[PDB]
């Protein structure tokens, strides 16, 4: 019916976020070698999760698992300063996929419990979110392990959908 695509580098906290929603079992599928998909199905909504960044294995086939995406959730480890530039590049490629041009964008600046984590303002500038045109976006500072911030960010995505 409608899909929410939640993607980001490995260890960003996406699986942690799926489990905190308590909207259904997390199911892992491996449609092809090197492509692990995690899926939660709640009513008419499908939450679809996989890791981006690095080799981008089976990238040309991602379109056939993108379909009917109404909102993108980009999750970043705010403490991972080593890979923030990689997260920016991976986000930009998602923002250029034709099947996702109309999808809303929620950004979770995750792991705000860590002492040296970049704040949402810094994450906003590092991701280049203000260069996004004609697409509504929103960024929330979160701690997925406590759940802090997830409701406020998903409140924006849900009310705007
Ligand atoms: N400190 C901290 N750790 C987190 C947070 N969210 C997730 N983690 C940890 O990061 C690791 C990877 O989380 P995971 O959900 O598997 O990330 P994924 O690979 O993107 O799905 C786990 O050990 C989590 O406990 C957070 O907000 N703060």
Q: State which residues form the domain around 140.
A: 1-161
Non-local CB neighbours of 97 within 8 Å, separated by 6+ positions:
62, 63, 66
Whether 94 lines ligand 1, by a CB cut-off of 6 Å, is no
Whether 110 lines ligand 1, by a CB cut-off of 6 Å, is yes
Classify 63 as helix, strand or coil: helix
Question: What span, in angstroms and rounded, lies between the C-alpha atoms of 21 and 40?
Answer: 10
Using the CB atoms, write b or e for 11-30: b if 16+ within 10 Å: ebbbbbbbebeeeeeeeeee
CB 7 within 8 Å of CB 52:
yes
Q: Can you read off the two tokens belonging to residue 103?
A: 């999808």
Helix (H) or strand (E) segment spanning residue 84:
helix 84-94
Strands (E), the chain: 2-9, 27-32, 35-42, 45-52, 69-77, 104-110, 137-141
CB 7 within 8 Å of CB 74:
yes
End-to-end, the C-alpha distance of the chain in Å comes to 13
* Nearest atom in ligand 1 to 144's CA: 27
User: What's the CATH code of the domain at 149?
Assistant: 3.40.50.300
Q: In angstroms, what is the span from residue 139 Cα to ligand 1's centroid?
A: 18
Question: What span, in angstroms and rounded, lies between the C-alpha atoms of 63 and 57?
Answer: 13
Question: What span, in angstroms and rounded, lies between the C-alpha atoms of 29 and 49?
Answer: 11
Q: In angstroms, what is the span from residue 95 Cα to ligand 1's centroid?
A: 24
Starting at the earlier edge strand, list the strands of the sheet with 2-9. Answer: 27-32, 35-42, 45-52, 2-9, 69-77, 104-110, 137-141
**The total number of residues written for the chain in this structure:** 161
CB 18 within 8 Å of CB 144:
no
Closest CA to 157 of 79, 64, 88, 69: 69
96: buried, middle or exposed (CB in 10 Å: 19+, 13-18, 0-12)? exposed
Non-local CB neighbours of 111 within 8 Å, separated by 6+ positions:
13, 77, 78, 79, 117, 143, 144
What are the catalytic residues? 55
Q: How far is CA 2 from CA 79, 82, 111, 127, in A?
A: 32, 34, 28, 26
Q: Which structural technique was applied? A: X-ray
Residue nearest to atom 26 of ligand 1 (CA): 111
- What's the total number of domains in the chain? 1
Q: In angstroms, what is the span from residue 51 Cα to ligand 1's centroid?
A: 13
Resolution of the solved structure (Å): 1.9
Closest CA to 118 of 84, 153, 86: 84
């Amino acid at each position: 019916e409608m899909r929410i695509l939640m993607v980001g580098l490995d260890a960003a906290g996406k699986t942690t976020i799926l489990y905190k929603l308590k909207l259904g079992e997390i199911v892992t599928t491996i449609p092809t070698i090197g492509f692990n998909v995690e899926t939660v199905e709640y009513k008419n909504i499908s939450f679809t999760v996989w890791d981006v960044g690095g080799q981008d294995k089976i990238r040309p086939l991602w379109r056939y698992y993108f379909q009917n995406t109404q909102g993108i959730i980009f999750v970043v480890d705010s403490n991972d300063r080593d890979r923030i530039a990689e997260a920016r590049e991976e986000l930009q490629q998602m923002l250029n996929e034709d099947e996702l041009r109309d999808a809303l964008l929620l950004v979770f600046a995750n792991k705000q419990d860590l002492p040296n984590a970049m704040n949402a303002a810094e994450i906003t500038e590092k991701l280049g979110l203000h260069s996004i045109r004609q697409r509504p976006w929103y960024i929330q500072a979160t701690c997925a392990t406590t759940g802090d911030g997830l409701y406020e960010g998903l409140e924006w995505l849900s009310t705007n959908l």
